[PDB]
Symmetry: C2
Subunit: 564 residues, 2 copies
């Protein structure tokens, strides 16, 4: 027999009614002059510290006045409020002080909630501060989560003041870890140089430990440029996933050095009978296909986005109704190969046009909810504040639209029109209209030209100029006649390309990528996507450009060759 529930919820609120009117007050806690009368029974059930001080049978259990030092009055009131109600009202301003008060009082409930709250709030401005906070209080869960964040953005957080004030042990494990996301070893060297000169009188004795952690005789990728680039086409990538593997871990190339630009395909068909919307990526350099996990747990019709800072996110989508639309939002971990969750959106969405502009992520379109109220729903997200905010909606409600960013400007395109959003003005300005009405097309950005390619699709290519505000035809995608190419515009190696999947009559899917000539207005054959890999991915697949860790992701083509 389980204990009563409606009686427990009534006994708890009856205790609060007595606490507010100060009945049965047997102990008075004195903290920096402020008095807080409470019950010895309630504090023991919530905090094990009071349970130990009251059950000891000493004068602390007999004296009504107990002086608690090094405890904030504001945090103590929150602990007592949680002891009589059970709801913890945490905020990013007083979470670090509440955790210090909770661990000093050893509250299993508050410590667990404050721990998971800090983990899901690790950004790029508090990573270093929370790392020293975790080491000071010995939180192995927060320390590991904060350390991985430092390793992911080490080249961007080593300028903060919190980095030069780190302890000696907090430095020896960061520099020795091979997860530093750095393109060159000089960045790690200079990061160690600025740390020792911050406080020379106290760190002059640690000069030997600093140089012993920075790899100087490593010579990761400066050796390949020395001899030559002579290899099969762009096989410098095979060395990245080979030499880096077998090494004494003292001269290993750091994880940042181990990076490869891969065409990220999300919601693709699965070779094995499974979640029909799988996620795999292809490396144009190593010509290899690596598999990606889907913690989204069968998300469908989702959007993609890649920031200039090489960050990957997904938003919106639909999950199978135990299909229902949700407002989920997940960030991909380039090292752990997962999909952590982040502050959800305000409105549920399906395939929103996610774009990054001036560090902000914008969710455009995405399954219009409430046609009577508004259909052109759009909202922005703050990377650090971790909050969502509504903005000026689209001037009209459209479907299957695309969104791009050029020169800190948000461009949304539709059937034949285009509107430009200015975050500095929070308004929409109609731009030059398109000559052809096309839908379901692909959009890309390169330099000062916006490309709206594909659409009904066709091989028609439109080149728009931001400086001239003109739409003009340049060329047609060279494809075989009577074919059905589902094209996707992608920019790689500082050059616009088209990932064209061609399916012909009675023929299987053929993948191939071409390179466009900007000066000659021509399309050159860049690379044929080997059919010994990259199985059929369907047509509704989403694609984007990003860099991932060949060193560590999930190398599994699983495509049996020697066929027919």
């Amino acid at each position: 027999r389980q204990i009563n529930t409606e009686y427990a919820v009534s006994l708890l609120e009856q205790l609060k009614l007595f606490y507010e009117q100060q009945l049965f007050t047997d102990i008075v806690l004195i903290v920096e002059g402020t008095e807080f009368p409470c019950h010895k029974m309630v504090l023991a059930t919530c905090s094990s510290y009071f349970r130990a001080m009251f059950m000891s049978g000493l004068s602390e259990s007999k004296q009504t006045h107990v002086h608690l030092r090094n405890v904030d009055a504001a945090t103590l009131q929150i602990i007592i409020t949680y002891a009589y109600t059970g709801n913890l009202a945490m905020n990013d301003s007083t979470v670090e002080q509440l955790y210090e008060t909770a661990c000093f009082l050893q509250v299993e409930d508050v410590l667990q909630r404050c721990r998971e709250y800090l983990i899901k709030k690790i950004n790029a401005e508090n990573c270093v501060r929370l790392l020293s906070f975790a080491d000071l209080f010995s939180c192995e869960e927060l320390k590991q989560s904060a350390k991985r964040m430092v390793e992911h953005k080490f080249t961007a957080v080593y300028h903060q003041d919190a980095f030069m004030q780190l302890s000696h042990d907090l430095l020896i494990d960061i520099l020795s870890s091979d997860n530093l996301n750095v393109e060159k070893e000089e960045t790690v060297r200079e990061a160690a140089m600025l740390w020792l000169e911050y406080n020379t009188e106290s760190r002059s004795q640690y000069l030997s430990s600093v140089l012993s952690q920075i790899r100087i005789d490593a010579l990761s990728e400066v050796t390949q440029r020395a001899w030559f680039q002579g290899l099969p086409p762009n096989d410098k990538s095979v060395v990245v996933q080979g030499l880096y593997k077998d090494m004494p871990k003292f001269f290993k190339p750091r994880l940042g050095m181990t990076k490869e630009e891969m065409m990220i395909f999300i919601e693709a068909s699965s070779e094995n009978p499974c979640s029909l919307y799988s996620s795999v990526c292809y490396s144009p350099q190593a010509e290899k296909v690596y598999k990606l996990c889907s913690p989204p747990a069968d998300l469908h019709k989702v959007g993609t986005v890649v920031t200039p800072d090489n960050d990957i996110y997904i938003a919106g989508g639909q999950v199978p109704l135990k299909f229902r639309t949700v407002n989920c939002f997940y960030w991909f971990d380039a090292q752990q190969n997962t999909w952590f969750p982040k502050t959800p959106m305000l409105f549920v969405r399906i395939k929103p046009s996610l774009v990054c502009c001036e560090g902000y992520i914008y969710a455009i379109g995405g399954d219009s909810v409430g046609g009577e109220l508004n259909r052109r729903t759009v909202e922005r997200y703050d990377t650090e504040k971790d909050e969502w905010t509504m903005v000026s909606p689209l001037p009209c409600a459209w479907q299957w639209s695309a969104a791009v960013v050029v020169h800190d400007c948000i461009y949304v395109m539709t059937l034949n029109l285009m509107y430009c959003y200015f975050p500095r003005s929070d308004s929409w300005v109609e731009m030059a209209m398109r000559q052809t009405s096309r839908s379901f097309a692909s959009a890309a950005a390169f330099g000062d030209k916006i490309f709206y390619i594909g659409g009904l699709s066709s091989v028609t290519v439109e080149i728009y100029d931001v400086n001239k505000n003109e739409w003009k035809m340049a060329a047609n995608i060279p494809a075989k006649r009577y074919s059905d190419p589902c094209v996707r515009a992608v920019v790689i190696s500082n050059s616009l390309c088209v990932f064209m999947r061609e399916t012909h009559l009675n023929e299987r899917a053929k993948y191939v990528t071409y390179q466009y000539d900007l000066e000659l207005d021509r399309w050159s054959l860049r690379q044929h996507i080997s059919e010994r890999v990259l199985w059929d991915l369907g047509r509704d697949f989403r694609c984007t450009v990003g860099k991932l860790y060949p060193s560590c992701l999930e190398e599994s083509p699983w495509k049996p060759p020697t066929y027919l």
Copy 2:
């Protein structure tokens, strides 16, 4: 924001864990030598007594040992268990002492739970004791319920020892009530006499108050026996619903002198658009139809059963899908026209064959065929223990079977076979088979003769309990080219059949016939016109019982004549 629930239950289970190991025990209650360590806060939050004792700021809030007298140790332990858990384990053996202990500590929750438990547990044995208990402890709801129960079965409970030990106020408030279910005032007179002679030395001064409450010059239904019975056919019931109403309440005929034998029709198709599955009753002596609020949960497919003590019950059936089958058991209050639910059945049933045998009501079949041993199950209810007991199940799975009781024996009939059950042996015995295989037939018990009438084609088949032989009697006079529908019921100590016949291009006709057992002939008894009656459908269940028309219900719902023969 609402108060958290999981944190509340976690705190409660942690407090229970601390109480089991005796942590932070600040008060020690001493009851008849037994010690109980406990917390003052829990006793204050639960009981208003301890709250007032602790918030007074006297030595009671400072002294750790508090001596509580006139409190049972087991009841105090149960109260503490409820305070630390929230569940109350009540039983019919220690409910009164628990209620007494609760009324001393004013545990609102425990008081209300014990009150409603005592209310739902008034049977035909504890009524007087519970009435005295409620009078001593001033519980108005329990007092009123026990008073109504005593008024319902006064002639059956005035022999109990608890009735002679009642106080003066209880006697003068029971005897003065016009709800005494007694057929003659001599019963109440003898009850008052035995009450006053039970303890003469203490009640010799109350003889005047005793004699002032018994109606002597009433002469309710003897005056009609003096002059004559000369009236329209059996119009004595008219005198009942007229003289009894307008009366100074001192010479009022008691409620027991008002009950009339009426044909109880349940699930009778109704013209009412909202309740088309209502129930109405017809009085053959009054030639009048009365409305019933029978459906307690707007359900149907429930059986009927009338004990020889004139008690109505319905069980089984299914409520519309909010058609989920249920187990609720409802007893009809003939005075308030409202059904009080009872202990639900163990297995759900649809139109169960409910019959009264040796004071027990047996549920026989009445369910869709599911499982060999899972179906054919028979279960009986205990009127006083308020529990269901399983018995020997049916030998074979049957459909549209009837059940009767003769000489305290159970009989169920089927297509062509027949099985007799004996509660003393708890076994099934196949009896004399019938020459015809029929279904949907109606059966009624009249003496040592079982009458199996129906078939869906009518033939009157007589079975002899003493001879175990089936003999043919007759065929119910009716019409083939039309629509027949018979309901065999025994009323006025005579077998009858209420036959509903729908003729070609004509509405349903109603008429009651009387059968002669000796001459083996069916005689026309009384034609039931549609003056206050209407189409009652075909799936309606029928039975015979005595009810008070005085305060049952008054609604014609049918204009007598409607002939626009003006032309």
